Amino acid sequence: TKFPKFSQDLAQDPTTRRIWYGIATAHDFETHDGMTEENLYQKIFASHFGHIAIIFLWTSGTLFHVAWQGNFEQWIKDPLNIRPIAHAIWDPHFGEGAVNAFTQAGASNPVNIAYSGVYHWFYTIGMTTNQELYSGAVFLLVLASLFLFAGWLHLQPKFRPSLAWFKNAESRLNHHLAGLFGVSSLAWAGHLVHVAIPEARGQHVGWDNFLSTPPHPAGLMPFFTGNWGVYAADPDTAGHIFGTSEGAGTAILTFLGGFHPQTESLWLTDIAHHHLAIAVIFIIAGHMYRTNWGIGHSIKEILNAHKGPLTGAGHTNLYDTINNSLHFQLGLALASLGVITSLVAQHMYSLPSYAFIAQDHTTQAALYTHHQYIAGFLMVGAFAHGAIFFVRDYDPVANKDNVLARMLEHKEALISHLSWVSLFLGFHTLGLYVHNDVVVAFGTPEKQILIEPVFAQWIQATSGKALYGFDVLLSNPDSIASTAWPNYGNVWLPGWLDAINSGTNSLFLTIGPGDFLVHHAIALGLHTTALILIKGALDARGSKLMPDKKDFGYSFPCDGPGRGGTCDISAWDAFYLAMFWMLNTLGWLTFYWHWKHLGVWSGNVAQFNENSTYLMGWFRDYLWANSAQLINGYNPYGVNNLSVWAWMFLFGHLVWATGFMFLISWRGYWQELIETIVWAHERTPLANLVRWKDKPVALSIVQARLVGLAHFTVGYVLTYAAFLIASTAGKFG
């Protein structure tokens, strides 16, 4: 009656549907009552400020619990031996067995071992005492306070920006490319050369000797005179020990391009030089778009001048399409962020840049799986907001004959081709897996279809991995690429070739016939998830089953049992199905990564290389073999430290099967069941006294599709996090 104050149509139904739909609709600011575009944008802006403060309070809490309850002082003595403590366990339910089991990593209290890798990150960026982390945590509390005050300030009518301020794409691109992506990268290169590189070489550069101690014995006058070679004078020698001065070198910017031979990570000077180059390129890229002064570009001119014969209108009227639509902007942002979160995951495991994080295996597994799951979620959200844009903000009159109109003008062709490629690739990946499985089971493993993944092996050979016998570009030192004949500027190449050809690191893993089939399974998952997502994006405006879906919106339940039956026709239901396929694909690739690295870390790579080509190899050497240490986390004899992970394993199974309840059984059964329960309550003595204000109804169709999806997701993630974190910590620390 009062709760969903943003929508009067929800403050009228006397059911529990208004509670559920108030919680769900609360952030869809476009559908609130009394909403103009200006109030939309200002409310969005202050919501962003609140969320920035959420992020800063979260990292403040991580810092404060590493500082207060963690063994950061002890861990930076020998990071290889001591496990990093995340925070302290305090619940009154623990028996004596659990308290003695969870006392670990040199503590008195029960503690949680940190698998987020924040210890390695804080140790690499130069933080070496609990007081430094406490100062960082209080500083981030103050920064979060500042952003909360900024959000409250920009809700004040004097400081509320106009619509022309929010619709200013060129100035925002200038200040984000230059001032946010370039100045922050420059400032990080400054922290690296002033604090992280010197304290990696031994000396303390705090806030007190910050100005008194130059990073280089040469001042900034060599930087101004152009003689920049002194900053790369003597690099860190290959016998350098992190945190102390043995063969330091005193070169703040070098480009060795290999790995540190002791921390197994990249050199901090190489990181600083990288961020300096990135800052220079991003700063000059932020001077591209027109602003109050005369020079620059206007994006409308750039877009509208790209008209070809094979598209016709080209990109005409795409500036107003992107600028006026917030779901287009959110789809582009989520697509790029999902791509670069995949990129973060794929590069932080093969090119680690933190001290001793390539030798702590559980945190590397947790970080990879975490960022690949975030990347899958963000990519699915990009396509979800593509569908929401096509429903809500898409104008087929202004977007006449441009690239968007021609996306929708042939959607059947590309949906049918995604159908063909996903069917083709799925038929033959399952065919090869079932063939290998059947002929291995029939006692004849020599009959397997084992395909050498020659293309990726050739890619590795082009990057310098000389194991496979190709001598093409960098594996052939006589070639034009390896010598770089005009200048011989390959300063990175000796270090890179020394790092790619060592069998220890995860940089360019050896790829065999078991990797071919899982890459094609991953391609199948990507293609089928993309098929469902674009089949919801392009059919959001209507198919022949329902030529008007733009008027029912994004997430209507169905269209009745007529027209044959119309159960999951909304674009939201294509989100739903592609959410399942995303979870499957990320399960496939994280299963593959996990088993490949359990082979690599243990040294017994033969297990993956012969047993990953058929499905019971995946089932008995990975799922069954590696859960042995998991389910024995608590047995009738006792309890060890992998007991909360066994409990989370079972917990995730339970959440998953409850998701099955919501996805399989549908609303009619539950509505008549609740009708019987309502009769029971209204007709019993002593409980007639208590009456509902909101009449109990079953969850809606789309609501319980969402709830089953949430259960499937949460149980799926909790089960796999428990398994992946207890299987590595079962056998690696």
Partner: protein, 153 residues
């Protein structure tokens, strides 16, 4: 952007609408204390006021009392708190006997003789109950410590 208006739009009443006296948080919080909450019978608001003060008055004599350095540390605090709640309820009922003798309306159910008598009764029950429950937690402090830390679980 003025934050200090007059009270309730009346510029001649002797009150300002400052951010402490007449804010939204103050209206929703002061106006939802038991002394001001809407619809409550006087017995329940007196009971809720009473427990908040019986639980309070245990502490000052328990930690700072003539018995704070003996084995009957909590019994002296409880005895002092019962003395204070007794004289508090005697004062409350005397105030009810005095103020509400001339007949008045029923715009507020608390500002009447039956309403103030119910308030005093609820205050007595709540005050002595809160005093005894704070005594019971303080006397059995080893038990509460052990169950919050997990010495018996």
């Amino acid at each position: 952007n003025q934050v200090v208006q007059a009270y309730n739009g009346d510029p001649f009443v002797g009150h300002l609408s400052t951010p402490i006296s007449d804010s939204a948080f103050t209206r929703t919080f002061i106006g939802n204390l038991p002394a001001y909450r809407k619809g409550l019978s006087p017995i329940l608001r007196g009971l809720e006021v009473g427990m908040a003060h019986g639980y309070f008055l245990i502490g000052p004599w328990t930690l700072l009392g003539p018995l704070r350095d003996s084995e009957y540390q909590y019994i002296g605090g409880l005895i002092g708190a019962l003395a204070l709640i007794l004289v508090a309820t005697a004062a409350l009922s005397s105030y009810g006997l005095v103020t509400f003798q001339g007949e008045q309306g029923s715009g507020d159910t608390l500002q009447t003789a039956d309403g103030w008598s119910q308030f005093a009764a609820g205050f007595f029950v709540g005050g002595m109950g809160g005093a005894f429950v704070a005594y019971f937690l303080l006397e059995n402090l080893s038990v509460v410590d052990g169950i919050f830390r997990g010495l018996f679980n």
